[PDB]
Design a protein around this nucleic acid. Sequence first.
DNA 1: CCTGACTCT
DNA 2: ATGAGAGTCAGG
Length: 566
Amino acid sequence: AKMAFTLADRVTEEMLADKAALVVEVVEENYHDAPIVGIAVVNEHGRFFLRPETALADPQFVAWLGDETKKKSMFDSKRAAVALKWKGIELCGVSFDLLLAAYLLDPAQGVDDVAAAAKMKQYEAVRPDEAVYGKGAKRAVPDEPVLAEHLVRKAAAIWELERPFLDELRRNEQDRLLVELEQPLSSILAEMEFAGVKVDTKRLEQMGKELAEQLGTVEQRIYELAGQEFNINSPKQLGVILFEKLQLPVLKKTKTGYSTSADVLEKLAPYHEIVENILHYRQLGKLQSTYIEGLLKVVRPATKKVHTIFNQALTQTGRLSSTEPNLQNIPIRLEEGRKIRQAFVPSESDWLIFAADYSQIELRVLAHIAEDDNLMEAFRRDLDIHTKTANMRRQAKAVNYGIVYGISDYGLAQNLNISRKEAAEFIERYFESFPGVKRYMENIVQEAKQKGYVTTLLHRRRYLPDITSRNFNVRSFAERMAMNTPIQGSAADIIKKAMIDLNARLKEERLQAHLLLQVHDELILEAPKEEMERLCRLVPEVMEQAVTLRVPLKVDYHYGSTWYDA
DNA sequence: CCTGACTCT
DNA sequence: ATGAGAGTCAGG
Ligand SMILES: [Mn+2]
């Protein structure tokens, strides 16, 4: 716990070396337009703390931040890059990101501060952020010397840990995955988040007014059918109405009481009309609470834009997630919810939304990895396995994905409301047709037991230390992760590479088009209307060619005046 | 704060 | 026991 540094009052030349650990500290969880509270730089010449007022208004320091040839090692460089964009400053030359390095080494550690990453290498001359800032209502930036010491210690830790982290990544064959995939993607995600998506608030507000009226009507109908007023949004009060007052069968219980899951209620429709109304009510109520009210709460009023954060170091499989707001779960399944997407519009007049989605991506990946000749030929014939297995097609999608990822006879039976005996026979016939898939799934489970981890196409890893558990439930869930993770994660790898390849192609061709969102196997862009034709060729080609498998990748695309129309 | 609901891939 | 990966919401 002994570390010297300069608490600097001005930027000096020796701070601007061509290699440095850099900390640009943003304490708020949502870093969009958030205060930068302090800066630290550690390099060959020493350790320095700078006040952002000073540093960020200094033309040489701003120039250095933006100079790609001056290399910066950081932790969560996207947070810094976006926070700096909101300050009108461009950040370039990030050559190492400890957050992403830690994530690739082991996603289960849930590393989300420098101290947590440092623990992976038994480095402890740095405190956890939470210890320094405090939690909840007590959260605060400490006195300058305390803050300064913390930021310097974090920079010093990044400085010392780069080599040990790079060496372990290299040993895992994950060095390129970091340097050539995740780090380049980080800068692309920063651009998307800062761009944001424009919202039609007039439209959304009108939808909200009309939805409130409809909710009230459905609500009263439910009370009439029930013979009583109650809170429909309380599974507890609802369970009393359904299973005590109305005396409906109890199909399922949870730890806290009667289940009122949508699966259960749907099965209760032969007994009472009220369950279909309740299902409808809870759909409408989610639309209003989340996609009208919740969405309007996060719209920046002056620009009418929403700015999501794509968490790149969270999911256990290599996927992204999207928060505040989540723009990866906007309704589409039912027309009533899908209408929400009419409120998502282009950020300029005479621009349009373009959306492209990989078809059956995880099934194509699986064909390649499992080397199932039958499935592999299906895709070479450009057939549609979803339609072949076949609302029908949508319901058949869940069956295909259910079956390959280990659904049981009980689960398939409950899903299709068919006989458990019949469900079992359908699963047996399915593997009959795709014997390579069955073989693969048996083999990957055994491999996970032997190695302790599974891997994706671009060498992403997930450790599965529970997979030999003597406990049936613990073991079985781990085995199913062994079946699913390599495929979901390989599909993640591919779309990440496609985003990188696509941005480069957009720059080369000097298009104004740019990415707005990624939704797991879909890419959403906006562009001038004149660029649509080019996009129809470019976007799908770049996506389809991101990797070369034993089967072709296929990408569907559409464009229009709103996201709904795309 | 956790649970169980609805939302997506 | 009973495909897997996510986030937000109201209720309690
Ligand atoms: Mn798709």
